[PDB]
Design an enzyme around this catalytic site. Structure first.
Site, PDB file in Angstrom:
ATOM      1  N   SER A 151      10.291  23.816  88.192  1.00  0.00           N
ATOM      2  CA  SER A 151      11.510  23.142  87.722  1.00  0.00           C
ATOM      3  C   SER A 151      12.724  23.574  88.548  1.00  0.00           C
ATOM      4  O   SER A 151      12.729  23.350  89.761  1.00  0.00           O
ATOM      5  CB  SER A 151      11.706  23.352  86.215  1.00  0.00           C
ATOM      6  OG  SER A 151      11.941  24.694  85.859  1.00  0.00           O
ATOM      7  N   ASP A 207       7.855  12.834  85.305  1.00  0.00           N
ATOM      8  CA  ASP A 207       8.273  14.161  84.892  1.00  0.00           C
ATOM      9  C   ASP A 207       9.195  14.090  83.676  1.00  0.00           C
ATOM     10  O   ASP A 207      10.136  13.294  83.639  1.00  0.00           O
ATOM     11  CB  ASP A 207       8.972  14.843  86.056  1.00  0.00           C
ATOM     12  CG  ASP A 207       9.369  16.247  85.741  1.00  0.00           C
ATOM     13  OD1 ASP A 207       8.532  17.149  85.944  1.00  0.00           O
ATOM     14  OD2 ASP A 207      10.524  16.430  85.302  1.00  0.00           O
ATOM     15  N   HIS A 267       5.663  18.404  82.602  1.00  0.00           N
ATOM     16  CA  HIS A 267       6.713  19.138  83.308  1.00  0.00           C
ATOM     17  C   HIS A 267       6.192  20.530  83.629  1.00  0.00           C
ATOM     18  O   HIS A 267       5.775  21.248  82.715  1.00  0.00           O
ATOM     19  CB  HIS A 267       7.991  19.213  82.458  1.00  0.00           C
ATOM     20  CG  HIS A 267       9.164  19.797  83.182  1.00  0.00           C
ATOM     21  ND1 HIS A 267       9.607  19.311  84.393  1.00  0.00           N
ATOM     22  CD2 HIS A 267       9.974  20.838  82.875  1.00  0.00           C
ATOM     23  CE1 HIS A 267      10.650  20.017  84.793  1.00  0.00           C
ATOM     24  NE2 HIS A 267      10.894  20.948  83.888  1.00  0.00           N
TER      25      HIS A 267
END
Ligand SMILES: COC(=O)CCC(=O)N1CCc2c1cccc2C(F)(F)F
Ligand SMILES: *[C@@H]1O[C@H](CO)[C@@H](O)[C@H](O)[C@H]1NC(C)=O
Length: 348
Positions: free
Chosen positions: A145, A247, A293
């Site tokens: 991330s 995502d 994610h």
């Protein structure tokens, strides 16, 4: 099994001025080093950073960090969990700068918070050289991330730093997981629009971006370099891109919250198509058609496959390619157009 070390240079700090640090598990027989950048969004003004300090303080401070952490996924030392690099030296760098790893500013009479992400990475690398990194053959800078975006922003600076410190034999590579975002139109408008928040963040953080990308976009437009498809072509270090086509963080900033009717159906399908398009000329990539994610520090990261190839295998094929390979692919992008059209997608 990863042990905490606070930085000996205590001027390199988390947001609140506490020392930054890293967790380390050495592997005596290995010349491979994996440095992983934690993620966790960001903050970009006094008010939203104050809120983050109340309820996400471990992302802003080392004061309450535990003495150890357990490595999971690509940070596991067990071959059963980590077919790729289980015997590597492992480093987990906590994200405590709230700046997408871009900041170079200290807490001072003018700054309530320090934003030192870019300097934290440099200082970790410098202090690791005395703990065995000096003998490395490969340094893989990985991250998920905001840490995945952090890889893109910092991998070439790590390569430059090692070259200027006299270690030109260490091969620096990047592994960017779930940090490849699109500055697309939102499904519904609101802030958040990440372009504007990153614009404000760079000024608030004294954020820095890779030099070639900076020279392309120039003053006031460096926010562009936070978007993978724009910064990646400017990079010299080999970078493997891992990105879910749908995502969850992308959908969140696009104001999508999941009986889907035609407008939203077309929006989601076009998002997957645009993501796939941006990866067309990324030779090392793994992009499954799933709504999820992050992947690489998840314990079941070995389970997802694209065209029958898992991510640990793709990464091993990447390693071989850097020494096409029969039956050892490195470019793995799903073409089916809807989340979970790949049966190996995470279940939740
Ligand atoms: C989560 C996270 O860390 N996200 C989501 C969107 C984003 C992040 C990090 C850096 C840049 C961006 C943006 F601006 F490209 F959308
Ligand atoms: C500590 O870090 C700061 C910022 O990166 C740097 O200017 C300074 O030279 C460093 N000092 C030592 C002793 O490493």
């Amino acid at each position: 099994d990863l042990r905490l070390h606070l930085l000996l240079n205590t001027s390199v700090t988390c947001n609140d001025g506490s020392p930054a640090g890293y967790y380390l598990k050495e592997s005596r027989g290995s010349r491979r080093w994996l440095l992983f950048l934690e993620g966790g969004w960001y903050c970009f003004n006094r008010e939203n950073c104050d809120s983050r300090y109340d309820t996400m303080r471990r992302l802003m401070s080392s004061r309450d960090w535990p003495r150890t952490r357990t490595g999971t996924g690509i940070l596991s030392s067990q071959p059963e969990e980590n077919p790729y690099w289980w015997n590597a030296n492992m480093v987990f760098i906590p994200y405590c700068s709230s700046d997408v790893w871009s900041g170079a500013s200290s807490k001072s009479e003018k700054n309530e918070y320090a934003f030192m992400g870019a300097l934290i990475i440099q200082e970790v690398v410098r202090e690791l050289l005395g703990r065995g990194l000096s003998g490395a053959k490969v340094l893989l800078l990985a991250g998920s991330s905001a840490g995945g975006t952090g890889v893109l922003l910092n991998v070439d600076r790590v390569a430059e730093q090692l070259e200027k410190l006299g270690y030109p034999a260490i091969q620096v590579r990047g592994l960017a997981d779930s940090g490849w975002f699109l500055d697309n139109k939102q499904y519904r408008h609101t802030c958040c629009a990440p372009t504007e928040a990153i614009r404000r963040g760079i000024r608030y953080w004294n954020g820095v971006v890779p030099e070639r990308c900076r020279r392309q976009f120039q003053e006031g437009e460096e926010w562009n370099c936070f978007f993978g498809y724009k910064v990646y072509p400017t990079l010299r270090s080999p970078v493997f891109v891992v990105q879910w086509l749908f995502d969850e963080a992308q959908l969140t900033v696009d104001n999508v919250h999941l009986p889907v009717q035609e407008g939203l159906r077309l929006y989601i399908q076009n998002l997957g198509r645009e993501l796939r398009h941006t990866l067309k000329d990324v030779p090392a990539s793994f992009a499954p058609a799933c709504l999820s994610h992050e992947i690489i520090i998840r314990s079941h990261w070995t389970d997802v496959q694209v065209k029958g190839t898992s991510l640990p295998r793709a990464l091993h094929c990447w390693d071989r390619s850097l020494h096409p390979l029969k039956g050892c692919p490195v470019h793995l992008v799903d073409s089916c157009p809807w989340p979970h059209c790949n049966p190996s997608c995470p279940t939740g």
